[PDB]
């Protein structure tokens, strides 16, 4: 069915930006701890909390 | 009188914090990695022996 509305449809130059979700997603449930503080480590890479 | 006599603001006997305060991050076998505090304490120690041998 026809939408009651008329849509502003046309080409537009879009850029793909450098932040992909699968490079950001992070979860931890117990993992590496700092030597000194005995607290969780920092960072996705380091398996941080 | 019990907890902070003014004379204790002056140090004569210095406590040495154990390794968990100044962890030796010891990587491999042929290598170690002493903490800043471990060096500064060795500096205190070095300076002290210098003084004690000098005055004696």
From Swiss-Prot, chain A:
Compartment annotation: Nucleus
Family label: Belongs to the RNA polymerase beta chain family.
Quaternary organization: Component of the RNA polymerase II (Pol II) complex consisting of 12 subunits.
Note: The binding of ribonucleoside triphosphate to the RNA polymerase II transcribing complex probably involves a two-step mechanism. The initial binding seems to occur at the entry (E) site and involves a magnesium ion coordinated by three conserved aspartate residues of the two largest RNA Pol II subunits.
Task of the protein: DNA-dependent RNA polymerase catalyzes the transcription of DNA into RNA using the four ribonucleoside triphosphates as substrates. Second largest component of RNA polymerases II which synthesizes mRNA precursors and many functional non-coding RNAs. Proposed to contribute to the polymerase catalytic activity and forms the polymerase active center together with the largest subunit. Pol II is the central component of the basal RNA polymerase II transcription machinery.
Name this protein carries in UniProt: DNA-directed RNA polymerase II subunit RPB2
Included stretch of the parent chain: 1079 to 1127 of 1224
From Swiss-Prot, chain B:
Free-text description of this protein's post-translational modifications in UniProt: The tandem 7 residues repeats in the C-terminal domain (CTD) can be highly phosphorylated. The phosphorylation activates Pol II. Phosphorylation occurs mainly at residues 'Ser-2' and 'Ser-5' of the heptapeptide repeat. The phosphorylated form of Pol II appears to carry, on average, one phosphate per repeat. The phosphorylation state is believed to result from the balanced action of site-specific CTD kinases and phosphatases, and a 'CTD code' that specifies the position of Pol II within the transcription cycle has been proposed.
Domain of life: Eukaryota
Region of interest (Lid loop), ranges: 23-35
Subcellular location per the Swiss-Prot or TrEMBL entry: Nucleus
Family: Belongs to the RNA polymerase beta' chain family.
Function: DNA-dependent RNA polymerase catalyzes the transcription of DNA into RNA using the four ribonucleoside triphosphates as substrates. Largest and catalytic component of RNA polymerase II which synthesizes mRNA precursors and many functional non-coding RNAs. Forms the polymerase active center together with the second largest subunit. Pol II is the central component of the basal RNA polymerase II transcription machinery. During a transcription cycle, Pol II, general transcription factors and the Mediator complex assemble as the preinitiation complex (PIC) at the promoter.
Subunit structure: Component of the RNA polymerase II (Pol II) complex consisting of 12 subunits. Interacts with DEF1; the interaction is direct and serves to bridge RPB1 to the Elongin complex in a DNA-damaged dependent manner. Interacts with the Elongin subunit ELA1. Interacts with the Elongin subunit ELC1. Interacts with ASK10. Interacts with ESS1. Interacts with RTT103. Interacts with SHE2.
Domain commentary: The C-terminal domain (CTD) serves as a platform for assembly of factors that regulate transcription initiation, elongation, termination and mRNA processing.
Protein name: DNA-directed RNA polymerase II subunit RPB1
Source organism (scientific name): Saccharomyces cerevisiae (strain ATCC 204508 / S288c) (Baker's yeast)
Gene that this sequence comes from: RPO21
């Amino acid at each position: 069915k026809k939408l009651m509305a008329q849509i502003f449809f046309g080409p537009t130059y879009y850029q793909r930006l450098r932040h992909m979700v699968d490079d950001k997603i992070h979860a931890r449930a117990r993992g590496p701890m700092q030597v000194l503080t005995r607290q969780p480590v920092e960072g996705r890479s380091r398996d941080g909390g | 009188e019990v907890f902070s006599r003014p004379e204790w603001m002056i140090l004569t006997c210095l406590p040495v914090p154990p390794p968990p305060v100044r962890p030796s991050i010891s990587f491999n076998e042929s290598q170690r990695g002493e903490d800043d505090l471990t060096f500064k304490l060795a500096d205190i120690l070095k300076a002290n022996i210098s003084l004690e041998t000098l005055e004696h």
